[PDB]
Amino acid sequence: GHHHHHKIFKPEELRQALMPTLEALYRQDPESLPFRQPVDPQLLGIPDYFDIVKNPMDLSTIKRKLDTGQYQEPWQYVDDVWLMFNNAWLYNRKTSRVYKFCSKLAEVFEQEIDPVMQSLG
Numbered sequence: 001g002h003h004h005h006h007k008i009f010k011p012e013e014l015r016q017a018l019m020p021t022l023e024a025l026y027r028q029d030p031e032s033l034p035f036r037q038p039v040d041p042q043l044l045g046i047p048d049y050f051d052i053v054k055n056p057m058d059l060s061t062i063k064r065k066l067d068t069g070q071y072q073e074p075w076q077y078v079d080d081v082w083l084m085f086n087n088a089w090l091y092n093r094k095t096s097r098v099y100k101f102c103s104k105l106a107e108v109f110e111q112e113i114d115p116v117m118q119s120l121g
């Protein structure tokens with residue numbers, strides 16, 4: 001998650017600072033592939049997905065929000081990234097490939113976001 005630590009940012013400043021962290025997620029192949037589009041429960045034959053997951057998130061949604069300047073503060077981007085991870089950890093079993101891939105992306109994200117957040121203050 002995001003955590004407070006003891007500033008209005010322009011959308012282009014956010015995009016510049018944060019986009020590399022998203023790019024690092026997309027670069028993980030094959031780990032990012034299940035996360036690049038919204039989960040489609042009809043194609044996947046999982047009618048209970050939206051019972052468990054009330055607030056879906058994925059990389060395409062995050063990218064669109066960054067691209068269109070929807071995040072006002074870096075913590076909002078960080079929250080959406082963790083939402084995506086937490087949803088995947090919640091729904092899928094720990095034995096599954098997609099859960100393991102989720103964990104791998106979260107490790108990459110933690111490593112990349114930390115120095116960025118320090119900079120942005």
Ligand SMILES: COc1ccc(N2C(=O)CCC[C@H]2c2nc3cc(-c4c(C)noc4C)ccc3n2[C@@H]2CCN(S(C)(=O)=O)C2)cc1F
Pocket residue numbers: 030031033034035037039040043044046087088091092097098099101
């Ligand atoms: C590249 O990594 C994967 C590639 C394929 C798979 N899958 C299988 O191994 C078994 C067949 C179904 C497939 C698959 N499972 C997915 C699960 C999710 C998902 C996530 C994330 N959070 O909750 C759920 C449920 C998402 C996609 C899954 N897929 C494939 C991978 C890409 N597609 S698609 C065509 O819908 O974009 C479906 C799992 C993977 F982790």
